[PDB]
């Protein structure tokens with residue numbers, strides 16, 4: 001209830017800033033397809049247990065739906081619907097020929113063995129084959145899913161389809177040995193770095209030697225901090241895990257920080273540096289701020305203390321709308337959540353193109369194409385933000401929903 005209602009409220013807020021017909025808004029409120037299936041597997045003890053799987057294709061006007069799969073024991077149908085709703089305009093803003101999709105299974109993979117995980121993935125594919133495909137619905141990695149599981153899923157889809165078409169293209173995020181694409185690990189970070197560089201160029205500020213404060217030191221956060229450090233010439237000054245944050249004015253090299261975290265389970269007490277909580281970490285005076293951690297991290301309470309000129313929210317909605325408004329009134333250029341982390345879905349689209357075309361690119365071509373796509377999308381959103389004189393999230397939403405609306409009108413779905 002809560003996630004889908006939040007998503008539809010955000011869609012209404014975005015739509016009231018532009019001229020969109022009521023019928024189109026009502027159509028976009030309801031996802032096109034919802035598939036709730038029972039996924040049965042045989043456990044290692046011999047018993048047969050059935051889980052509940054959801055596959056929501058929110059829209060496919062612009063093209064085949066693209067959406068991730070989450071294996072976590074809490075999400076429900078409404079959560080998957082809201083995430084597919086987000087995926088729709090996340091692929092729309094990047095100007096991809098994709099619709100919005102999402103997948104999930106109510107399951108806790110912590111206690112599932114490797115054989116059990118493989119059986120669950122294969123049975124999920126067997127259940128949802130009738131509504132997925134290379135040209136209809138492309139699954140993507142998400143929470144608690146890895147390239148191994150979706151290599152298994154692609155194998156099952158190939159077995160069912162009898163190798164009639166491009167099986168490798170049914171699912172993305174696959175291992176490089178079987179249908180994989182270069183740059184998948186660094187996709188989100190690369191997209192975020194491209195967006196930060198474009199925002200800096202828009203603001204006319206040089207990034208040579210500037211300061212970046214990154215909250216959240218996961219895979220995406222670490223790669224963002226590193227890619228900033230070398231590519232942007234930026235001085236990394238803040239990285240935080242779930243335990244605490246690390247500060248040093250002179251600069252941090254993410255490699256040894258990651259080694260320390262892997263050695264002792266956390267980055268706490270890094271040599272030659274001070275320990276600061278994430279709450280005061282968001283209060284640093286830097287040039288770039290990157291929240292790459294738990295969502296709704298910047299709230300209305302601490303929004304007044306934010307001083308970074310450019311903030312790029314890698315995480316999914318880590319800034320509350322009120323805090324977003326307070327950052328807007330402070331002259332702070334803020335990259336939308338679904339535009340900053342769109343590198344992952346853009347690289348997944350590139351992987352799908354490689355699979356369907358039968359031609360595999362090098363990391364150089366993938367990086368160049370991701371750079372071009374990010375630049376074009378960001379500057380389209382930036383021009384919209386100046387033209388309509390509304391916040392950057394709303395500009396990105398307007399661009400994405402306008403693209404989806406135009407796709408619907410061209411297909412004849414909506415006559416208004």
Ligand SMILES: NC(=O)c1ccc[n+]([C@@H]2O[C@H](COP(=O)([O-])OP(=O)(O)OC[C@H]3O[C@@H](n4cnc5c(N)ncnc54)[C@H](OP(=O)(O)O)[C@@H]3O)[C@@H](O)[C@H]2O)c1
Nearest residue numbers: 146147148149175185216217218219220240241242265293
């Ligand atoms: N075939 C393949 O290519 C393949 C297969 C398997 C794995 N992999 C790779 O192996 C990795 C698996 O690990 P992961 O991606 O799950 O790592 P992660 O989520 O970034 O974090 C590692 C673990 O630490 C916890 N954690 C959460 N937030 C954290 C933070 N800020 N700092 C430190 N720890 C935190 C997480 O559990 P909680 O959040 O619940 O505390 C998680 O289980 C993947 O990134 C994937 O690329 C690849």
